[PDB]
Amino acid sequence: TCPMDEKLLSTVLTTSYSVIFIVGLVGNIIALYVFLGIHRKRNSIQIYLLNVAIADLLLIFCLPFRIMYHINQNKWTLGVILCKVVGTLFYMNMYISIILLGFISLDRYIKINRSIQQRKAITTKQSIYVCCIVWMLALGGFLTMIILTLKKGGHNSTMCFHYRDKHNAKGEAIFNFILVVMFWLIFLLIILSYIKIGKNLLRISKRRSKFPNSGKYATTARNSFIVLIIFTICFVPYHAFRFIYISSQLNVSSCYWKEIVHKTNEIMLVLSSFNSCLDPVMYFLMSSNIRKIMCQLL
Ligand SMILES: CCOC[C@H](COC(=O)CCc1ccccc1OCc1cccc(Oc2ccccc2)c1)OP(=O)(O)OC[C@H](N)C(=O)O
């Protein structure tokens, strides 16, 4: 455990996480207000996005502990219990957000590309069913893993969010490895969905059957590509490097690899958490009614 300099890393992480925290807080507050205050009725996609907003708001509420830890002296003043609570809660919220974004991709694909008329907008029932299942499965994993870590593991210290060996705890490592591959499957589904949606909207706009609103389809096709690219840049490099993280952490090696691996992991955490603040903004910007409201109000 080489105690290497991280003051510049601490400062850059503190600044990045503070900006992400404030932007995500304001964005998720606005998203909750619009999904509750002015949205009387919900469809499957809107319920999905409300749950994404709740997960992102929980990750944003998790962030201030991280910024305080990084800014104070890069040491954790409080107990290991809160360290474990925050560390597990941040990751569970992140993966809930990822899963629900994959479901938003999927139902957008089935609703736009292949649907002919409608499904009478009764897909909401299965939407809350899937949302409840995912939240219950996340909460169960949260409780079991935290209750195992607090008692079974004797590694209690005054340092948090740091690099640790997984010789004592290999279940956490294998569960993280499974999380990465399921995230990659979700990302492949997301990219397929959004490429197909964009191509369908471009061909529909290119046919130009009716002159009115023949240019909004091109805008919607562009928006699909934009949201797919934002998701990619936010999440892909992180889970690309998490493989090297696990490979280095599950075997004995010189700490010289460890500092650069830890620094890369933290930088990728910054990009991943930035999606939390970005997600509410894309809904407001890509919605024609909300965009016009923003344009006329400003
Ligand atoms: C105990 C400290 O945890 C935080 C971190 C280590 O994080 C991991 O190894 C990944 C997260 C993880 C993996 C395996 C099991 C539970 C995990 O915690 C989150 C979680 C909870 C519940 C469910 C769940 O998976 C879901 C699956 C399906 C649906 C919804 C959720 C995930 O350690 P630390 O804070 O020290 O940070 C180390 C390092 N800086 C860094 O960033 O990894």
Author numbering: 45 to 342
Paper quotes:
M1 is an analogue of S3E-LysoPS, in which the fragile oleic acid is substituted with a more metabolically stable aromatic fatty acid surrogate (i.e., three tandemly linked phenyl groups, with two ether bonds). Local refinement with the mask of the receptor improved local resolution of the extracellular half of the receptor, and the resulting cryo-EM maps allowed modelling of the entire complexes, including agonists. The overall structure of the M1-bound receptor superimposes well on the S3E-LysoPS-bound structure, with a root-mean-square deviation (RMSD) of 0.73 Å. M1 binds to the hydrophilic and hydrophobic pockets in a pose similar to that of S3E-LysoPS, and the head groups of M1 and S3E-LysoPS form comparable interactions with the hydrophilic pocket. Compared with the S3E-LysoPS-bound form, the extracellular portion of TM4 is displaced outwardly by 2.6 Å, due to key differences in the hydrophobic pockets. However, within the hydrophobic pocket, F2195.39A mutation increased the potency of M1, suggesting that its bulkiness is not essential for M1 binding. In contrast, L2235.43A mutation reduces potency by 10-fold, suggesting that the L-shaped hydrophobic constriction formed by L2235.43 provides the necessary environment for binding M1, but not S3E-LysoPS. Notably, the ligand RMSD (Root Mean Square Deviation) with respect to protein (the same below), illustrating the average change in displacement of ligand for a particular frame with respect to a reference frame (initial frame), is smaller in the M1-bound structure than the S3E-LysoPS-bound structure during the 1-µs MD, indicating that the binding of M1 is more stable than that of S3E-LysoPS. Critically, the metabolically stable agonist M1 nicely fits into the L-shaped hydrophobic pocket in the TM4–5 gap, forming quite stable hydrophilic interactions with the receptor.
